[PDB]
Amino acid sequence: MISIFIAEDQQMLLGALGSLLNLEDDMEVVGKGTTGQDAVDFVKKRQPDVCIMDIEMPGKTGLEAAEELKDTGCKIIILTTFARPGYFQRAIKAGVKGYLLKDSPSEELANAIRSVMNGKRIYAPELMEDLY
């Protein structure tokens, strides 16, 4: 069973993502948060296998949270509206294992969690497609 923490400031989306992932037999949402701090606190304390991280959240962004969790051993997958090369470069330098867009098909999220748990790096193809 893969343990997942979800950090997403928009409650409707946070609740819907937890519901989308609890559909999976080999996955479990162990906690939900709305800020970068909620992610840092849970991940350092509860140590879930995976953290689904939104970027733009109040207080501390998901990129800032990812930097604070760089040496924790948790596999961070960024899930954001923003296809920004600066956000992506800061995310990869922080050691994130994935970077997905909120415009990626929903099925790609559970797939990315399994891939990342298998040591793979998952970046939405839509990113390169947006830039070029």
Closest to 127 (Cα-Cα) out of 81, 83, 87, 90: 83
Per CB under 6 A, 81 contacts ligand BEF: yes
Nearer to ligand BEF, 48 or 80 (CB): 80
Report what 108 binds from a second copy, ligand BEF, Mg ion, none; CB cut-off 5-8 Å by kind: a second copy
Cα–Cα distances (Å) from 17 to 3, 4, 102, 115, 128, in that order, read: 14, 11, 11, 18, 25
Nearest approach, Cβ of residue 101 and a second copy (Å): 7
Per CB under 6 A, 126 contacts ligand BEF: no
Binding mask 1-40 for Mg ion (x = CB under 5 A): --------x-------------------------------
DSSP string, 52-73: EE-S--SSS-HHHHHHHTTTS-
